[PDB]
Ligand binder design. Structure first.
Ligand code: COH
Ligand SMILES: [Cl-]
Length: 210
């Protein structure tokens, strides 16, 4: 199968397990609240910041350029959401990475410094295609259960993308058309599994003490 299908199939079980995370399932079903949603978004800001440094380095090396669309960048959008959610900008210098986020950020920094294009594409798929594909569902559950205002849910909307269904189709085709040696393809597929694990661990840390 093409790369896009192999990525979907190889991470499908991990995706189901993510939906059934105690923390995330509690958040989505309305058992938590805006503050816990804000805690999630703070951790996400930390890992998206690192992810986007790795994207920038890999794009600058000339690898996967058409996939690495800067319109996908989420860190600054997330920061605007968090300014609203937290009521001030102080969180920027106060939040601390959980142990899982330290691990995730460390890997993204390794990918940046090694300019590991195939690994970066795996992380790009796991975060951005998931955001493009499922973000609207998550945002709607925060609005409905907790009354989060849409202005604090900008992370879940891609302003620079006019035709979302078309964009997702074109993204998958770019994955299919990415030239990869056998070794690079195996490295990318393993990395996608690892990226799901890191994301699952973020939820586990957020759930501590609940
Ligand atoms: C409950 C909502 C929910 C959660 C918690 C969730 C948790 C996560 C998560 C957390 C660790 C990650 C890394 C992802 C990553 C992805 N999600 Co979701 N997703 C979610 C709702 C969706 C929806 C909706 C889609 C589109 C397909 C579908 O199953 O409806 C989705 C699709 C994806 C895709 C695209 C698959 C493909 O077409 O190849 C990726 C990647 N994801 N997702
Ligand atoms: Cl940004």
């Amino acid at each position: 199968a093409g790369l896009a299908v192999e990525l979907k199939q190889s991470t499908a079980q991990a995706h189901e397990k993510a939906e059934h995370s105690t923390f995330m399932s509690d958040l989505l079903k309305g058992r938590l609240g805006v503050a816990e949603f804000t805690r999630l978004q703070e951790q996400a800001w930390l890992f998206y910041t690192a992810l986007e440094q790795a994207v920038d380095a890999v794009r600058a090396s000339g690898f996967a350029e058409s996939l690495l669309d800067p319109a996908l960048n989420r860190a600054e959008v997330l920061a605007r959401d968090l300014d609203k959610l937290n009521g001030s900008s102080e969180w920027r210098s106060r939040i601390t990475a959980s142990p899982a986020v330290i691990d995730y950020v460390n890997r993204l920094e390794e990918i940046r410094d090694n300019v590991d294009g195939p690994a970066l594409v795996a992380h790009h798929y796991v975060r951005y295609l998931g955001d493009l594909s499922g973000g609207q569902v998550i945002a709607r559950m925060m609005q409905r259960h907790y009354g989060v205002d849409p202005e604090a849910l900008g992370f879940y909307h891609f302003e620079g993308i006019a035709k979302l269904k078309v964009y997702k189709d074109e993204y998958r085709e770019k994955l299919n058309n990415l030239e990869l040696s056998d070794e690079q393809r195996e490295h990318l597929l393993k990395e996608a599994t690892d990226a799901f694990v890191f994301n699952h661990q973020v939820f586990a840390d957020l759930g501590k003490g609940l």
